[PDB]
Symmetry: D2
Subunit: 234 residues, 4 copies
């Protein structure tokens, strides 16, 4: 959607389905080289890659459970081995995991939610950072980190979702620290967050352009530390 995305090396965690996949398809159309990721390879992964290549981009799939640091390191290393560097990281791995009210929150549930939603983002960003910085140094422009937030990161998680909302609030805040200390490395950090004034739920296609906007130096070069909610007024 932006001319300066052509050839950009874009790693998108949690892109085997949903918003992540929709976003990956848009980047490929823009001519980007896209790292697809999930815990397991989709059965139709070859078709998806073929389509992304037909659309004028490139794609490769990487399997990993990003709940551990070693998996985050391996994903980054595999992606760089394939495409030679990183221009854009999209942290979209994560999710609800399950729903448990406070009296039912044990260690196993806590660890599941916190590792899936926070450790994944912190460690993947950590390992991607030197690559993102090197890319920005080489181009004289900016590299981009975009993490997926939630409306719950603003006003709290729903039933059984206390930890999920708070985990997303964590991400909103840690990005502020990353802005303060890594703007000097040429990396911009922004967040997209996929009763309702619009009277309907949003689609995956409606969440995707915002990711490309935040990824494009042309579009958003002076924009960092932002949280863009896509919620039809919710």
């Amino acid at each position: 959607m932006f001319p300066d995305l052509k050839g950009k090396r874009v790693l998108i965690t949690g892109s085997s389905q949903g918003i992540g996949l929709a976003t990956a398809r848009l980047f490929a159309r823009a001519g980007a080289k896209v790292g697809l990721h999930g815990r397991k390879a989709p059965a139709n992964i070859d078709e998806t890659i073929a389509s992304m290549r037909a659309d004028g981009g490139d794609a490769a799939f990487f399997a990993a459970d990003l709940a551990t640091s070693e998996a985050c390191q391996q994903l980054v290393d595999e992606f760089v081995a394939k495409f030679g560097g990183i221009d854009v990281l999209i942290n979209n791995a994560g999710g609800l995991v399950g729903r448990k009210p406070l009296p039912e929150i044990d260690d196993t549930f806590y660890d599941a939610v916190m590792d899936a939603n926070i450790r994944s983002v912190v460690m993947t960003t950590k390992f991607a950072l030197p690559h993102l910085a090197a890319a920005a140094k080489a181009s004289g422009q900016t590299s981009a980190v975009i993490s997926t937030g939630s409306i719950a990161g603003h006003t709290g998680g729903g039933p059984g979702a206390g930890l999920y909302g708070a985990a997303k609030a964590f991400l909103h805040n840690v990005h502020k620290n990353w802005v303060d200390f890594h703007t000097k490395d040429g990396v911009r950090f922004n967040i997209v967050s996929p009763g309702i004034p619009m009277g309907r739920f949003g689609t995956a296609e409606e969440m995707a352009p915002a990711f490309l906007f935040f990824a494009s130096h042309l579009a958003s070069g002076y924009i960092t530390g932002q949280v863009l909610d896509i919620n039809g007024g919710q």
Copy 2:
């Protein structure tokens, strides 16, 4: 920057210079029909209009002081008479008026700041609304209102700018009400909130002050007017942002306080 902006009728208040102008230019490059506005025509207005038309857009200039409701209604009426409707309203008119500490804020100054920055936005949006709604009904998509906020609307105005910051905070909030009651009219309301931008707005600042500010911004400099523009087009494009409403997007290089 987005293909669905071609032919869109875009009224941009405060677009003679600076952010408003840079934004107008980008819209015309996208093929939009742009209403340019200021209190009086700038010396370069013919050149500006020519460039916008060469780009495949269109442009017409409208003079108004939007401090009164009558001027807001007349601007909207004149714009509709020229272009036939409204798809996008950008409320960018406003300004400091001056810098006065609290002890020096008399009615003249208070009224000047409040009318320039708040009444202008409320009344211009009011008069544009039926047109924006009709356009959305006709297209089956959405029309857009985008208002210019400020970093000051989050963390407070600087020296003598207490009313200016608070006026911008007013705009940030009133948009929430408009989302709640006019989303059903097919209108999306969003805010672009510039930080410190290298425009006439900050031309009074000494080199020492500019340097001080620049050193405190993570990106190490003031923004440019051109760095503000893409966000407006993004919010104006149903293709790009059709499920986005009631957002405030800060363009500040990491800066959150004056």
Copy 3:
């Protein structure tokens, strides 16, 4: 409710009824000298003053419509003529005025809401400031400004209440400027803001202690620029 409120000179705008009056009664119990205010004197004003004096404080009533600057100046002057200075200003004048949707917002309604809710606060604070500063200089402690906000100043006004919510948001912000530029004058600026998790609406008595807390240097001497919502989780 706090021992250091004894003898404090407390001007409370919009205190002839409701939250303002309830707050005034608490200050008088704490031994404060209280300026009561409304557009018109209540029919039972003499009884109210007598009660406040019986409770160990003092009270006087001042009539004014604070929609104009001259009325704000006159109120401050009358209060200082009566009590000799100002330690605490509570800006509680204001209100909805009426309910009009955007297409019905004309100049007369706009002016009504904006003057009642914003001009009143800006001008009363302006005229009270030199007195507040002199009081803080003399005691070596702090003087206090407390303005009444609303939940609407955070999440927007309800039906026909767009301007009211936004006016309260204005107050939230202008206080930040006043913190930046008048903390040096020994004045603290805070806000109290009187579907619902608690399953009930709040009372005037439940809104009052927060005002005394923010007014007491002992309780809140390092606290400024705050907004305390009293809404049962709303």
Copy 4:
């Protein structure tokens, strides 16, 4: 500071020193029965307990590292065994652990910060909740949970403190969920969020750094632990704050960024 605190059973995690201790002292002066807590007893613990008892309150010390759920459950159980129930929980345990830039954040450090600051609050609140609810049911009023946030939870952690700031932001948010689902249990949840306070927390800072910070704070200095305490009592008192829940109160002398 409030008459209804007399006899209240108040568990304060991280109360050996600093803010937690100053808060504990003020509660005991109000006649409360206070649970003091740290990883190990401070040298002055007998003196502290003596002073609190002389004031007409009571105090007992409980050792725990609240990084594990087991330790949180044991603390709550031991407190209830001593005092018979819980009226107020103050979650003040936490800390930096260390300062590490993002490249240096390994699992050991991450786990240490996250467990110390988040798991501690989640698990201690979980185990205290049935007691807090029973106390509120019995009194016909409310019990209170107050957690210590931070300025950093709003605007981000400083050098090497990215996880600490974000952990505090986590606490600010999770309280919203607890309000939504446990208000019906008669428990109010509020946060006291200190700015820069003159405690052991900042003892590592050079004079140059302390001076720099102090000059940027509107009130011109770090806060004291004693300046934090009244807010906790305010939030703990049903008399004072019975209709107040889900609030975050910053005590920062006008400072909003590190």
